[PDB]
Design a protein around this motif. Structure first.
Motif, PDB file in Angstrom:
ATOM      1  N   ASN A   1       0.788  -1.228   0.000  1.00 29.94           N
ATOM      2  CA  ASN A   1       0.000   0.000   0.000  1.00 29.94           C
ATOM      3  C   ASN A   1       0.827   1.288   0.000  1.00 29.94           C
ATOM      4  O   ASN A   1       0.273   2.384  -0.106  1.00 29.94           O
ATOM      5  CB  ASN A   1      -1.046  -0.003   1.131  1.00 29.94           C
TER       6      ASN A   1
ATOM      7  N   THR B   1       3.094   2.217   2.459  1.00 27.71           N
ATOM      8  CA  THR B   1       3.637   2.497   3.788  1.00 27.71           C
ATOM      9  C   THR B   1       3.852   1.219   4.595  1.00 27.71           C
ATOM     10  O   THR B   1       3.169   0.214   4.382  1.00 27.71           O
ATOM     11  CB  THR B   1       2.718   3.433   4.609  1.00 27.71           C
TER      12      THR B   1
ATOM     13  N   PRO C   1       6.188  -2.004   6.499  1.00 29.71           N
ATOM     14  CA  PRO C   1       7.223  -2.982   6.150  1.00 29.71           C
ATOM     15  C   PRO C   1       6.964  -3.709   4.834  1.00 29.71           C
ATOM     16  O   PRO C   1       5.821  -4.040   4.512  1.00 29.71           O
ATOM     17  CB  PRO C   1       7.167  -3.971   7.317  1.00 29.71           C
TER      18      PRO C   1
ATOM     19  N   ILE D   1      -5.689   0.689  -2.313  1.00 32.18           N
ATOM     20  CA  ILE D   1      -6.065   1.997  -1.797  1.00 32.18           C
ATOM     21  C   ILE D   1      -4.879   2.593  -1.044  1.00 32.18           C
ATOM     22  O   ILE D   1      -4.354   1.977  -0.116  1.00 32.18           O
ATOM     23  CB  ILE D   1      -7.281   1.909  -0.858  1.00 32.18           C
ATOM     24  N   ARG D   2      -4.454   3.786  -1.451  1.00 33.11           N
ATOM     25  CA  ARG D   2      -3.320   4.445  -0.815  1.00 33.11           C
ATOM     26  C   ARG D   2      -3.730   5.777  -0.208  1.00 33.11           C
ATOM     27  O   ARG D   2      -4.411   6.582  -0.849  1.00 33.11           O
ATOM     28  CB  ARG D   2      -2.198   4.679  -1.825  1.00 33.11           C
ATOM     29  N   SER D   3      -3.312   6.003   1.033  1.00 27.71           N
ATOM     30  CA  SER D   3      -3.534   7.277   1.709  1.00 27.71           C
ATOM     31  C   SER D   3      -2.560   7.400   2.870  1.00 27.71           C
ATOM     32  O   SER D   3      -2.203   6.398   3.493  1.00 27.71           O
ATOM     33  CB  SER D   3      -4.971   7.385   2.218  1.00 27.71           C
TER      34      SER D   3
ATOM     35  N   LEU E   1      -6.145   7.375   6.006  1.00 29.21           N
ATOM     36  CA  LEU E   1      -7.533   7.231   5.545  1.00 29.21           C
ATOM     37  C   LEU E   1      -8.544   7.881   6.484  1.00 29.21           C
ATOM     38  O   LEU E   1      -9.550   8.435   6.039  1.00 29.21           O
ATOM     39  CB  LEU E   1      -7.891   5.753   5.348  1.00 29.21           C
TER      40      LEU E   1
ATOM     41  N   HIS F   1     -11.735  -1.097   3.701  1.00 29.86           N
ATOM     42  CA  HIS F   1     -11.031  -0.086   4.480  1.00 29.86           C
ATOM     43  C   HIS F   1     -11.972   0.779   5.311  1.00 29.86           C
ATOM     44  O   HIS F   1     -11.528   1.487   6.215  1.00 29.86           O
ATOM     45  CB  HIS F   1     -10.203   0.809   3.555  1.00 29.86           C
TER      46      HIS F   1
HETATM   47  C1  LIG Z   1      -0.659  -0.100   4.781  1.00 23.93           C
HETATM   48  O1  LIG Z   1      -0.230  -1.198   5.560  1.00 23.93           O
HETATM   49  C2  LIG Z   1       0.168  -0.881   6.881  1.00 23.93           C
HETATM   50  C3  LIG Z   1       0.567  -2.174   7.593  1.00 23.93           C
HETATM   51  O2  LIG Z   1       1.163  -3.086   6.694  1.00 23.93           O
HETATM   52  C4  LIG Z   1      -0.943  -0.153   7.646  1.00 23.93           C
HETATM   53  O3  LIG Z   1      -0.402   0.417   8.819  1.00 23.93           O
HETATM   54  C5  LIG Z   1      -1.629   0.948   6.836  1.00 23.93           C
HETATM   55  O4  LIG Z   1      -2.862   1.266   7.440  1.00 23.93           O
HETATM   56  C6  LIG Z   1      -1.903   0.526   5.397  1.00 23.93           C
HETATM   57  N1  LIG Z   1      -2.359   1.648   4.590  1.00 23.93           N
HETATM   58  C7  LIG Z   1      -3.488   1.587   3.888  1.00 23.93           C
HETATM   59  C8  LIG Z   1      -3.866   2.799   3.090  1.00 23.93           C
HETATM   60  O5  LIG Z   1      -4.209   0.593   3.875  1.00 23.93           O
END
Ligand SMILES: *[C@@H]1O[C@H](CO)[C@@H](O)[C@H](O)[C@H]1NC(C)=O
Ligand SMILES: CC1(C)O[C@@H](CN)[C@H](CNC(=O)C(=O)Nc2ccc(Cl)c(F)c2)O1
Ligand SMILES: *[C@@H]1O[C@H](CO)[C@@H](O)[C@H](O)[C@H]1NC(C)=O
Ligand SMILES: *[C@@H]1O[C@H](CO)[C@@H](O)[C@H](O)[C@H]1NC(C)=O
Ligand SMILES: *[C@@H]1O[C@H](CO)[C@@H](O)[C@H](O)[C@H]1NC(C)=O
Ligand SMILES: *[C@@H]1O[C@H](CO)[C@@H](O)[C@H](O)[C@H]1NC(C)=O
Ligand SMILES: *[C@@H]1O[C@H](CO)[C@@H](O)[C@H](O)[C@H]1NC(C)=O
Ligand SMILES: *[C@@H]1O[C@H](CO)[C@@H](O)[C@H](O)[C@H]1NC(C)=O
Ligand SMILES: *[C@@H]1O[C@H](CO)[C@@H](O)[C@H](O)[C@H]1NC(C)=O
Ligand SMILES: *[C@@H]1O[C@H](CO)[C@@H](O)[C@H](O)[C@H]1NC(C)=O
Ligand SMILES: *[C@@H]1O[C@H](CO)[C@@H](O)[C@H](O)[C@H]1NC(C)=O
Ligand SMILES: *[C@@H]1O[C@H](CO)[C@@H](O)[C@H](O)[C@H]1NC(C)=O
Length: 339
Positions: free
Chosen positions: A118, A120, A122, A156-158, A161, A214
């Protein structure tokens, strides 16, 4: 052995020296040739943290694209900070080419190969490379065009969120073509974009279901943008040097969740600059057919605030921070310094 670090990158491309096209001209003078046999070292049992939202590679790409547009797309009239610049504004050849971003000696680029990453946190499958993949510096709002696709699921990227002020990047796993034309023959600024409604509404349905994962299975609703500059309320993009503004109301109505969708568009000579530096006026469109066929590979969304006490979440197309465009491609990379 390494650590997160920022350093000045260089660029590589397959630009042609004899081309008058401005991206080619820029890259010819600002980039080096690509490596035909680049090395990629997949790291074993390495766990690396990434953060697409705080990544200096994005700032550096923005700097390049600004320099490219500054040198290649000068407006007849530029209105900035109380000032008024006038200059020649000839018609140009314009068609974005892939640009690779590369680390100098002592540094390397780590690349996340986790298939539903996504942007962010690891990453488990990490490789090190000298250069990113070829990224076309496509400037647009609402819809991300001609970009790379997600390999498995829609992503989904943010940055957060839970914060509705933070832009959401939707990464599609299947292209939907958008066919934009200012026909030869009238209103020389009137244009339109054609989209397969069957394809689009299917993808949008898939986006809806991903957004549910999400947002605790709340009901997902799309609505047209609330207000703001035309660059944001419309899908704006550049086709052949011309600035297109398209009404996406038909794309973001929740009712179709089959025929051809025809968005009404308009070529604008006067625009709010994405470089964020005021207004510009360009010359009228060239004659003849102006046509760009693009893949929609992503969507920029903003979520409505004030919906916590209801079962709905409302999403509207957005954008305007062009850095988010570069993020949509640079999310899987970060620069590290090597001992
Ligand atoms: C991306 O994944 C990390 C844990 O792997 C999480 O903290 C974060 O909420 C996630 N971001 C999205 C937009 O789902
Ligand atoms: C509303 C406010 C202050 O915030 C920004 C967007 N959130 C917006 C500025 N952004 C822009 O003007 C912009 O992107 N313009 C713009 C111009 C040409 C093209 Cl092809 C494009 F895709 C975008 O102005
Ligand atoms: C990492 O690579 C391995 C080997 O292909 C694979 O089994 C695993 O699913 C990958 N992990 C992710 C998150 O993609
Ligand atoms: C458009 O999308 C198709 C299918 O994903 C792909 O084959 C083609 O290369 C894309 N064109 C671009 C990215 O300019
Ligand atoms: C795209 O991702 C969705 C989940 O977001 C999945 O249901 C669908 O099978 C994927 N389609 C393709 C072409 O991989
Ligand atoms: C995410 O945004 C919410 C809502 O504004 C805020 O309460 C929270 O502190 C944010 N989370 C992080 C990690 O900053
Ligand atoms: C784009 O649409 C026009 C009709 O408006 C059509 O003539 C042309 O073939 C289309 N391009 C593609 C690749 O479908
Ligand atoms: C619209 O989408 C469907 C489903 O992918 C596709 O099979 C069909 O060819 C498209 N319609 C047109 C006019 O091409
Ligand atoms: C949504 O509903 C499905 C089916 O009941 C459930 O399995 C899942 O836990 C829910 N997802 C959420 C609330 O994110
Ligand atoms: C887009 O079109 C609709 C009618 O289909 C119109 O009511 C709306 O105001 C338009 N949006 C913009 C930003 O002009
Ligand atoms: C959304 O699309 C449907 C297609 O049937 C149409 O009936 C409706 O008027 C549209 N809403 C708009 C354009 O605001
Ligand atoms: C997307 O890529 C296609 C194929 O190279 C190109 O014709 C079109 O102009 C591109 N769209 C934009 C907005 O640059």
């Amino acid at each position: 052995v390494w650590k997160d670090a920022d350093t000045t990158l260089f660029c590589a491309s397959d630009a042609k020296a004899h081309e008058t096209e401005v991206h080619n001209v820029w890259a010819t003078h600002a980039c080096v040739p690509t490596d035909p046999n680049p090395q990629e070292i997949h790291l074993e049992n390495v766990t690396e943290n990434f953060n697409m939202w705080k990544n200096n590679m994005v700032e550096q790409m923005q700097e390049d694209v600004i320099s490219l547009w500054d040198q290649s797309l000068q407006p007849c009239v530029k209105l900035t900070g109380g000032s008024v610049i006038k200059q020649a504004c000839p018609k140009i050849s314009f068609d974005p080419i892939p640009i690779h971003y590369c680390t100098p000696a002592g540094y390397v680029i780590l690349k996340c190969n986790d298939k539903n990453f996504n942007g962010t946190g690891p990453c488990k499958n990490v490789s090190s490379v000298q250069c990113t993949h070829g990224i076309k510096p496509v400037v647009s709002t609402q819809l991300l065009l001609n970009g790379s696709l997600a390999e498995e699921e829609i992503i989904i990227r943010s940055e957060n969120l839970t914060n509705n002020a933070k832009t959401i990047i939707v990464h599609l796993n299947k292209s939907v073509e958008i066919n934009c034309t200012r026909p030869s023959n009238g209103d020389i600024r009137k244009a339109y974009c054609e989209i397969n409604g069957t394809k689009w509404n299917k993808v949008l349905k898939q986006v809806t279901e991903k957004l549910k994962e999400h947002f605790n299975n709340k009901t997902i609703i799309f609505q047209p943008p609330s207000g703001g500059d035309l660059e944001i309320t419309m899908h704006s993009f550049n086709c052949r040097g011309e600035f297109f503004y398209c009404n996406t109301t038909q794309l973001f109505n929740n009712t179709c969740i089959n025929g051809t969708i025809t968005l009404p568009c308009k070529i604008k000579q006067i625009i709010n600059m994405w470089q964020g530096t005021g207004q510009a006026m360009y010359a009228p469109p060239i004659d003849g057919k102006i046509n760009c066929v693009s893949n929609i590979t992503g969507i920029l969304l903003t979520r409505d605030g004030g919906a916590n006490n209801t079962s709905n979440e409302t999403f509207r197309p957005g954008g305007g921070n062009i850095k988010d465009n570069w993020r949509s491609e640079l999310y899987k990379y970060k620069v590290v310094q090597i001992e």
